[PDB]
Subunit: 177 residues, 2 copies
DNA sequence: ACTGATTACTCTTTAACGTAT
DNA sequence: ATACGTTAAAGAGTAATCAGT
């Protein structure tokens, strides 16, 4: 039971988790709202996940990350709690990945740029052209998350598939009209 | 409405011979003018929400049968509006464009009105709305869910005051 | 009165799907 | 494969209510 014991929280690292939340609760909530959002953009974490896990309101949340819409300390604490825990989950997600022993896919900005330029060359890409974009996009989402491309399976639902690539061109071609 | 019982068939029959995007911009203009929510459409007609919005706003095509259900509702709808304004679905209020520039203009003059300013602004907004729908401002009870009230003016100025954040 | 916090509702956007070649 | 025609899901904007100042 080695890996699951890493997974368990050492009492000291638990006090660190709680300490970080208290620190942010004394910082500018607008300042911490930026980084929560930017992190949610770095890993393309739907707010619905936060709304589901936290118990907050999508609008109050959306308002609080898009604008400096204030929110009471108790509710912000839940967001801050979820934040520090998710950091560990995504860390393991990638770490415990690449080896063998209900979120929706969302196109990341880096991949989007890759795809747009490719659409200019050939709007209806060959299957091999499509696959070569998958890895190139996967790598870009990997380096955007600061992880090695090897741990691409950690992207989870945000893992680019050849089917998803073709769809992008398909919908974007469908948007020609 | 037997006098026009088949006129409406002629309307929808015309409309479906008509260009799809043209009739789509038309109903949206109609909905925007009377501030009718797309919900009520989706509720009565039964077409998919996303499809309707993607069609009324961008030109996404749909089958004539589904298109006919919209046209049938559009023709129908005209009757209730005119009949109800003449008479003089818990839909939610929505501010109409002419009413906003009125309220916005009043904003710079006074961020925090008092009661008498709010209620005078009411009628002014109810005017423009009745005018925007080509009906005498006397028939404002027909605006119904879109009838401006004082509490709404306070809420408007309130919410617009929270803009600072 | 009013700020303040909070929310149900409405709708545009998005990725995905099936059908009929 | 491709085009369509169609849509569940995600999020931001809108109007609103309750309560502590």
């Amino acid at each position: 039971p080695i890996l699951k014991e890493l997974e368990n929280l050492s009492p000291e690292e638990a006090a660190h988790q709680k300490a970080v939340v208290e620190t942010l609760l004394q910082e500018d909530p607008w300042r911490v709202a930026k980084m929560v959002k930017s992190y949610l953009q770095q890993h393309n974490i739907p707010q619905r996940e936060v709304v589901d896990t936290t118990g907050l309101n999508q609008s109050h949340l959306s308002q609080h990350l898009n604008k400096g819409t204030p929110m009471k300390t108790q509710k912000r604490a839940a967001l801050y709690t979820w934040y520090v825990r998710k950091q560990r989950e995504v860390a393991q997600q990638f770490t415990h990945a690449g080896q063998g022993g209900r979120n929706r896919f969302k196109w990341g900005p880096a991949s989007q740029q890759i795809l747009f330029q490719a659409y200019e060359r050939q709007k209806n890409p060959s299957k091999e052209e499509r696959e070569t974009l998958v890895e190139e996009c996967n790598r870009a989402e990997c380096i955007q998350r600061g992880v090695s491309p090897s741990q691409a399976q950690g992207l989870g639902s945000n893992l680019v598939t050849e089917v998803r690539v073709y769809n992008w061109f398909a919908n974007r071609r469908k948007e020609e009209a």
